[PDB]
Amino acid sequence: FTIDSARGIFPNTLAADVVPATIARFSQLNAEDQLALIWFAYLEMGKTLTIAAPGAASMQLAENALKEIQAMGPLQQTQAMCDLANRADTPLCRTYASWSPNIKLGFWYRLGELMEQGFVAPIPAGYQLSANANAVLATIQGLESGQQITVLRNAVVDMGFTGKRIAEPVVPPQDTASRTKVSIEGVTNATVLNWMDNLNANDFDTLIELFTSDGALQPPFQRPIVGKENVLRFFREECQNLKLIPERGVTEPAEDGFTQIKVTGKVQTPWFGGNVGMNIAWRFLLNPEGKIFFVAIDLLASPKELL
Numbered sequence: 001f002t003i004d005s006a007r008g009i010f011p012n013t014l015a016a017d018v019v020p021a022t023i024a025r026f027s028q029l030n031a032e033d034q035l036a037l038i039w040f041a042y043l044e045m046g047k048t049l050t051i052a053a054p055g056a057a058s059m060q061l062a063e064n065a066l067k068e069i070q071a072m073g074p075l076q077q078t079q080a081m082c083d084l085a086n087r088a089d090t091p092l093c094r095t096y097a098s099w100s101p102n103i104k105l106g107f108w109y110r111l112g113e114l115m116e117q118g119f120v121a122p123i124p125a126g127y128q129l130s131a132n133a134n135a136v137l138a139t140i141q142g143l144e145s146g147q148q149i150t151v152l153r154n155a156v157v158d159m160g161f162t163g164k165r166i167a168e169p170v171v172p173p174q175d176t177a178s179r180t181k182v183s184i185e186g187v188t189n190a191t192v193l194n195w196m197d198n199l200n201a202n203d204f205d206t207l208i209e210l211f212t213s214d215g216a217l218q219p220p221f222q223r224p225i226v227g228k229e230n231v232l233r234f235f236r237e238e239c240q241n242l243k244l245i246p247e248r249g250v251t252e253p254a255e256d257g258f259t260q261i262k263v264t265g266k267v268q269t270p271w272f273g274g275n276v277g278m279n280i281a282w283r284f285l286l287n288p289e290g291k292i293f294f295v296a297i298d299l300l301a302s303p304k305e306l307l
């Protein structure tokens, strides 16, 4: 096995590839239609799902960009938002591209509040989506909530123009005494249990020691992130305050004393807490010493894909 060939383990696992399909269709749209479609999706989703407030540190890091937009005339505000959607080369688009996903999300959270209050130029009253945009919004509105929030996040992350990296401060790991231990039907493997428990505790320095030097982590619909430096950076920038709720799994040998393990269960993002449970598979390829050579996290097509 290489990292790229390990991508093929448990080929029965049906991922929610409607998510990248929908992002590809979204990406073709006119910029004003991209912004209007997300505005409509976010207004309707907000009737049943409450988004958690951005953290104080995130809002401070986005404050100067938000102040610049708030000082613009309405036409310039709309143009700045279109620049982000179009991935135009501007100072604002370069600042935005330097940000972690959580800072980008907090930026748009605040613009949404200001658009609702009427202090930043809103989507025009009575705005009608293009033929392609109406169909993209219909697809999004038919998806499970876990898939909807993944489409919105991926759309937000893809905006701006791509280098210096700006992320939220790393919060200290949970005190040992207060930590929870997961149980997984079928799976007693210490590496897998330690994975789940250390991520639930934000203990990234313990987590990274589970990997081989050349090991990789593959997030949903992304390429593998290879080696301890790049994986630890991903943990610290993007993986704080998750709740992993694994349910059940299966343990099999792989070539050369390797072990392949598949776990299914749910994950909560701190943006939605218990209000959105994403259906997830973990696919592990462990070397003979129990180190992680490869771990993939898949967003599942439906609850029918849970073991």
Ligand SMILES: CC1=C(/C=C/C(C)=C/C=C/C(C)=C/C=C/C=C(C)/C=C/C=C(C)/C=C/C2=C(C)C(=O)CCC2(C)C)C(C)(C)CCC1
Pocket (backbone or CB within 6 Å): 035, 036, 038, 039, 042, 051, 105, 108, 109, 111, 112, 113, 115, 149, 150, 152, 153, 156, 199, 218, 219, 220, 238, 239, 242, 244, 267, 269, 271, 278, 280, 297
């Ligand atoms: C744009 C825009 C607007 C505002 C949009 C806003 C405000 C959207 C907000 C969206 C949000 C807040 C979405 C959040 C989604 C979060 C997700 C989907 C998280 C998933 C995490 C997972 C699945 C992690 C799994 C992992 C596991 C389990 C591991 O074991 C290892 C690590 C890792 C792989 C990370 C307005 C309206 C103004 C209109 C104009 C344009």
Ligand SMILES: [Cl-]
Pocket (backbone or CB within 6 Å): 238, 269, 270, 271
């Ligand atoms: Cl998150």
